[PDB]
Symmetry: D2
Subunit: 478 residues, 4 copies
Amino acid sequence: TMKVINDPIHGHIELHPLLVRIINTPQFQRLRYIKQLGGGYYVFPGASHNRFEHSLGVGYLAGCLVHALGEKQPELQISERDVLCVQIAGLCHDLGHGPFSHMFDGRFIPLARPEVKWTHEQGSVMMFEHLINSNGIKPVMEQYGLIPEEDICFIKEQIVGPLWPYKGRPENKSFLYEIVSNKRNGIDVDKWDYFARDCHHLGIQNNFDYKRFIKFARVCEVDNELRICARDKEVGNLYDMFHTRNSLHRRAYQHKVGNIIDTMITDAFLKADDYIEITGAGGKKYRISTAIDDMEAYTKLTDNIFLEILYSTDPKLKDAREILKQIEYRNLFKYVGETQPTGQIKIKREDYESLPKEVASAKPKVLLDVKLKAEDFIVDVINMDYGMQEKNPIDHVSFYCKTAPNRAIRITKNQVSQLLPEKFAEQLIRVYCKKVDRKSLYAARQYFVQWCADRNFTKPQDGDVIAPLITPQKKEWN
Amino acid sequence: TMKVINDPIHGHIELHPLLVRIINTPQFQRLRYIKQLGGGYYVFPGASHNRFEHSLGVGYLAGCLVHALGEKQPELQISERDVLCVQIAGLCHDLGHGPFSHMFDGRFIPLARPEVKWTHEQGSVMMFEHLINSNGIKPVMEQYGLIPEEDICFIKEQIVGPLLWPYKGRPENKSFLYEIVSNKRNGIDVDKWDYFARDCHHLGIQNNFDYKRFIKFARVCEVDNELRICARDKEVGNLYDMFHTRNSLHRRAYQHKVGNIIDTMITDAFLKADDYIEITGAGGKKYRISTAIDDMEAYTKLTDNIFLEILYSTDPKLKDAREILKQIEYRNLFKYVGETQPTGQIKIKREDYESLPKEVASAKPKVLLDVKLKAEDFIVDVINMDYGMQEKNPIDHVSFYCKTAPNRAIRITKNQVSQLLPEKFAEQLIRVYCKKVDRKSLYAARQYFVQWCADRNFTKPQDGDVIAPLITPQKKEWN
Amino acid sequence: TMKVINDPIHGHIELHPLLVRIINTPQFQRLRYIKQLGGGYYVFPGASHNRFEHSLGVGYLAGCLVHALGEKQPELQISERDVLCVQIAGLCHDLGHGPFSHMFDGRFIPLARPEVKWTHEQGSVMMFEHLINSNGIKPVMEQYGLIPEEDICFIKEQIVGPLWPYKGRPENKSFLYEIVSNKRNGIDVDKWDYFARDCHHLGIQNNFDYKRFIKFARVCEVDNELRICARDKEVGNLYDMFHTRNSLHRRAYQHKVGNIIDTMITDAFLKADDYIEITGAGGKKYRISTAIDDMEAYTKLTDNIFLEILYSTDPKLKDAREILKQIEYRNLFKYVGETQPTGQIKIKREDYESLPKEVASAKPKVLLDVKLKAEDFIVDVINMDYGMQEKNPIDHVSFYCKTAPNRAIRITKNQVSQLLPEKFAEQLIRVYCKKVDRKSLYAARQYFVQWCADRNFTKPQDGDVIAPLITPQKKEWN
Amino acid sequence: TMKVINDPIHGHIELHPLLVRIINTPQFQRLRYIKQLGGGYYVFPGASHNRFEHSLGVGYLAGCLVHALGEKQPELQISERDVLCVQIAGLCHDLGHGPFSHMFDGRFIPLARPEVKWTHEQGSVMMFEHLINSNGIKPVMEQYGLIPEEDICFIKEQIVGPLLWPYKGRPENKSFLYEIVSNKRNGIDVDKWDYFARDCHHLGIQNNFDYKRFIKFARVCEVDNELRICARDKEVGNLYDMFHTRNSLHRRAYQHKVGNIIDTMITDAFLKADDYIEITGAGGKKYRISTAIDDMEAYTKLTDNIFLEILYSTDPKLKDAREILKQIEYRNLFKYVGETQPTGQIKIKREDYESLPKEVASAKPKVLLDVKLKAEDFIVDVINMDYGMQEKNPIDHVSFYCKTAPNRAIRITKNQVSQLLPEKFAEQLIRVYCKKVDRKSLYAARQYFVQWCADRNFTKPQDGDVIAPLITPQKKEWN
Ligand SMILES: Nc1ncnc2c1ncn2[C@H]1C[C@H](O)[C@@H](COP(=O)(O)NP(=O)(O)OP(=O)(O)O)O1
Ligand SMILES: Nc1ncnc2c1ncn2[C@H]1C[C@H](O)[C@@H](COP(=O)(O)NP(=O)(O)OP(=O)(O)O)O1
Ligand SMILES: Nc1ncnc2c1ncn2[C@H]1C[C@H](O)[C@@H](COP(=O)(O)NP(=O)(O)OP(=O)(O)O)O1
Ligand SMILES: Nc1ncnc2c1ncn2[C@H]1C[C@H](O)[C@@H](COP(=O)(O)NP(=O)(O)OP(=O)(O)O)O1
Ligand SMILES: [Fe+3]
Ligand SMILES: [Fe+3]
Ligand SMILES: [Fe+3]
Ligand SMILES: [Fe+3]
Ligand SMILES: [Mg+2]
Ligand SMILES: [Mg+2]
Ligand SMILES: [Mg+2]
Ligand SMILES: [Mg+2]
Ligand SMILES: [Mg+2]
Ligand SMILES: [Mg+2]
Ligand SMILES: [Mg+2]
Ligand SMILES: [Mg+2]
Ligand SMILES: [Mg+2]
Ligand SMILES: [Mg+2]
């Protein structure tokens, strides 16, 4: 029978026994030990929530959406098999996150292993595999009518991605790939859970209503494929859903101090990578940066690694340790400012590594007790968008009208409002300095404002205050 | 001593005894009987809150903001006198609302009395006066150190605006105090803070604006020889979001197309009863629903009750008004036909509102009509949506300060913040409804309406291809 | 199809079209104009909620409970017919409330019409009838498979009450009478809605979890009747549910000032009863106290009557009007104190009318500038209990164990905790005075404390402060 | 200047720079790594909150209560010095918790070191000292007007209790200040206020106690020649309810039978690793999990991390400890057999706890056993539930005041309030579990257990008729 668990976002929820089996493994339980927001806790003290609780929510919401499509449209032929496959994918979608979640695949692995291209989603697919194989799950699947050759492939495709590119289900069931991770427009139950769950812990209040969206969702034919569509009148609510997502990145997930703590932690991990060993399959030894290649080692790789370093006495870890100690005493690299590009220019990823030199080379009208080298500056480039680079995701939604419920239509931005955004992607540039005394910091402010003046970037907000000698060098800034 | 009242939004709050005296009058207590959202309750059933509770909130928030400026900046010389004046203005700011709140000054009075220019705010100033004079409040004011010649004028100016430096009630060294209750400079005031949180609690839509945060990072600075309320630089994102919230609540709630049509029907019923209902005012004289605004003793008795007065009547002269209210209860409302907007930098002037139904009725549909409809059959509702300052960006009229130079104000432009912010700050929405509700009449109304949009070069209705498949292909600008 | 309404307690909920038909009548819509808590709004300013919204909640919760029993136990043979009958009874259960809700049947009608025995529930049954007959509902019922001779009788029995006493369903469906109004133990969805809804508006927070109770509810055989039973482990939560109910009466619904405002309003209505006329069926004229005998007149009788009196100019209503004006200026009868009986004594309802004389006759050790008559005192006797006079309602619940799910058992108080109440009913006595100057009030405090001393009632809490000369007359009170 | 932090329970709060200095130490930051509810997270998945956030809350509430007494009663002469001392004690009150919080001082240390009498509070006093001394805080204190000889002693006494009038840190005219952080007189303190609201937020169980209300109606009065915090008379009902809430949260959450068994298993694992894990302390010395309490430099590094240290190890000497932790992850827990309570005025003394499993194992079931079970197979968990003062009514140790005589304290007895309040204020619950988990072993455990209850004259288990139908009829007292 069901097992009931009490979650503070979604209340008392029912867990099917196949879900319970998957949950009660070391591979799943690992997610108790990885914080959702990583370094965000060191800015927002309510944000101690881990990936475990998020994963139960996503699995529960995935079931809610699929059941409701089924009740109202029996003609879709949604079976109990289908429902369970969707539920499992929801539950297991984030099994591949590593320590501090997006710090791990966003910053560490790219710095430590420039030869691979990895994502937490690929991790989730591998860790799902290991979990199934190492705990006897396959017979239990069959015991509830699932067919492993086909259904495991279906689960993995829902998590990671792939005429018709899918082996696990055919075109008459394409709507099912739109639940857990929606590649077409990004409207998925993953976002629904983290919006509500992150807001509860952060202390910032949620303004999106997922339950409403589920009441007015429907499957229609669009270009010979069955797809999830929304009532026409929900269009304003979907623009607002993406606005919420951007707001939460601005206030929380990209908080300038949040990001710098993740940077320092990444640093500390880089200086310990050589010296820590994790035992994997067949007794072999892996490092923090290679543990991703062996799921038995990866199983034991969690936020704990922070304290392993912080509590060590090995002299080979002193360097890594001293960085973590600077965090505890709150001696953080200092935030210098933010700026953005201009015209319609972009900054290409190749050039990220050249930026600190450029700042160091700005020749401010000299009144300076220290000259600063490139090693002293960090430049953090952040790409903010509506989840589809510079496209409008609402261009990739279909709607229906009360008068013709089986007929999809499109609704353009013009038809909605002139107060909507004109663009859907931008870049923010933050600069910090590692030298933390008043002299070094004063200087760094001058280099930085000169650099913005030189590249024709926006004028930093406090520019007149931090660099009164420099902001006059542009007419364009009065 | 203080009196403590428990409010569900703000919790346990302390009411100074002068505030208690003002509250316990028939002029104040009237606000128990006027719904904050008017016809909105007939769409959102949690929205039974009245103006009374809102007014206590605004008064409590006004005192919060002023005390906090005081604690942190003793150099401003904010007195207890000042605090109480601010508290009273917060409390009395909406005393002039009439039945169903914005329905009354937004729709009824303009239809019924085109010759006057009236607002609920001017009502509040007059009703404040009546309340003071008819309840002996002036002595009590003095008893707590207020000076009525000056302080009444101060209270009134905070509510309505001004009646070189246009204020008689306080001088330029106290200009920040006019920015609390109703902020004419940029619209960031405690009225909005209370109704965001209060409306969201009752509607079942969740609020994302944090007023308390704003108050922690607020500060008084000199800007163009005037002392003003300014905010930390890092709050700029949150202020754009505050205005976004306001606009969202109009789209979801306050301008819901069925909410507005209920307010329209109620305004109709009031128009057809205006001749026949009599409200006794000062010196025994008789007023009507449309004239009660001219006598505060009559206006005191003018509340949402008037709806039920009409609905429960037997007078044969009220049958017309009554039949409309019956159509509401059985849920036979006018039918929504659709929405459209203008284009380019075209605008629709308020003079022209009354001509629109004729224009819709005169659309020449391409040789396909079995029944005509007249202008009397259509409603056309023009709604101005903006960031509270017509077409201006209100964030251009905010001043900021930086952590390193706390006494020095600055400005921050839109492009220093984000490329994803709105490119405009005002727009108009046009809704069309039909009073004939059968399938035939409604089909036809959809054709006239989509033709009209095609003719005036307005945007394409969302469901246009579904409701008028024969028309929407005829237009280059839409395919 | 369904119609969706957004309620702030229960969210977006679905209304079956037969429910929509019943809702969109003058008989139903009347409930927009009767406050749930009556005079409670004049103490708790958030408490402007009306009976309309409560009634939609009860109808929605009734459907939730019945559907969930059905899903999990197909063998009960719960049909769509049954579900709809339960939903309708939920929706229409409070159609008979009059102005200010419990003020009307608790105070006014007993004073104004001592010859009848009336309750809001009997009103609901009559008003249901009128609503059906006067709006053509009967064909619509049949159109969804309902059978009016039987099903209307079922609905009415669920609301008001009745070997087996029920004509509308047989013993194999007795559990259905336990949803809307539970006569056996009082655990019903009416309470669930008002707990949550009243807490939202009052500003006091709810500590009972109805959704939990629904997950662990089950139908078992008990004395040859099918009944709703709960998991064994919920026993503590049910004691706490009744504790919550008592707490909400103490803090809110019996607030001493709340009750006195209801008293003054009742007064005002008594002095207008002769002079107000409500037109009923066949042009006949009814009064506030007789409108309960004609549903067409009763339809137009709501909280509006307060303002009708307050706004009048008719000289025959001056008396009633002046009472309402005393409310607006906040010149309320003054609260003197509270006391309770002692030993295990009770105060019988016959004697209520003699109490003010008794207080007036107390001979305090005289230092008094006014002597006071009986007409000057009010004595309000309040019976507080767990909804079953002096029984323990948890003695009338059945439970089941995880090991034997179809087998009912009982759990006694002893088996649970020694910190539970020893009694389940008590009476509170409040005294007020209508003379409001300082002299009259000081005196009233002396009469009252002498009276408590005389009848051997508990010592008023502030006794030593309000009557320092009198509390020494008892050794037993040091 | 102030530093503002956003807490989800209390919102945006201001941290004095001395508080910031104390917070940004390894001794304070340690609390990020100890779960408030210990094994409770393994039952309630929202309960991942740690002691760090709680400690910020308690510190903020302590300042709220003391400032409010100050505003309303200037005659108390509460200084800024006093306020800061109270704030610091609130903030540092739980610095001595160890891994999994109450598991550590409730279960592990008593098992592992029966010779000492230790509490997390005494830990907090020592860890406070270490934090001050190892981070240079004493100068900073003086820099804001504190006097360390006196003020450190004051802070410590507020946390732990006393070290005629037993306090060295403040005199009798300031006794009310000891009633804020940890109230020895009646248990009404701000620690409880924070954890009620914080635990409820994370658990998904809703709180019904309103602290802010309590603070509006609090007042300092003379009672038996000592100045004390007193409450309005009308709050008496709410205080009985505050203690009812506390007891409800233990029944639903903190003593959940599976929560407690997880804490038991973890304590087991710690016992089997104690010999083999070494924590470096002051002057390079090595401590164990059970001795780290004797050296604050070692104890600094002792947190919930130790669980994962064991779980992730490969040392063969830790296999025993590791295997228990693996049984947790696969969800093979000890099995709950049932609950019972004593009767009359019988009590179970703490000495005897260790003898109970033998007694259960020795029940002679009526000639019906195919397998025996040993004492090593049973757990018996005795839990003391009370209103925080053993068997006393804490409301007997509260003072009240009346609206008409605000400076004069009084008492209110139980019978002046209600006949529905509890007749007792303490009880014991006994839970029995089995470490053999198969159907045979479990069946048998149920027989031994129900026989044992029948033998000692304890209450009848809830499911007794279902689990042991052959035994429950044999007992007069139960049918
Ligand atoms: N009174 C209460 N109120 C609220 N939540 C509660 C609660 N009691 C537990 N929870 C939460 C804690 C969990 O997250 C969830 C399930 O806890 P159990 O219902 O206690 N189920 P278990 O498996 O112990 O008993 P069995 O196997 O006998 O059915 O409810
Ligand atoms: N237990 C409670 N919990 C929460 N709010 C409560 C409450 N009791 C009342 N309220 C609400 C109702 C009101 O909004 C407010 C104050 O009611 P009182 O504190 O009852 N004050 P009053 O003037 O009756 O007594 P006095 O003059 O002797 O002080 O709190
Ligand atoms: N964006 C929004 N967010 C939250 N609640 C909303 C909302 N819009 C409406 N409500 C609430 C108001 C109501 O309580 C409920 C239904 O409002 P509609 O969904 O607007 N349904 P209607 O009958 O106008 O349109 P149709 O007939 O075309 O389906 O949702
Ligand atoms: N928009 C927002 N809304 C709510 N909480 C927010 C927030 N932004 C931050 N927080 C939370 C995070 C923290 O708990 C707190 C303060 O963060 P900052 O106000 O960002 N202060 P910091 O020290 O970075 O900047 P400076 O030194 O220049 O003043 O509010
Ligand atoms: Fe996710
Ligand atoms: Fe307002
Ligand atoms: Fe009800
Ligand atoms: Fe604590
Ligand atoms: Mg993911
Ligand atoms: Mg995604
Ligand atoms: Mg009072
Ligand atoms: Mg206004
Ligand atoms: Mg305004
Ligand atoms: Mg009822
Ligand atoms: Mg009932
Ligand atoms: Mg900072
Ligand atoms: Mg403690
Ligand atoms: Mg304590």
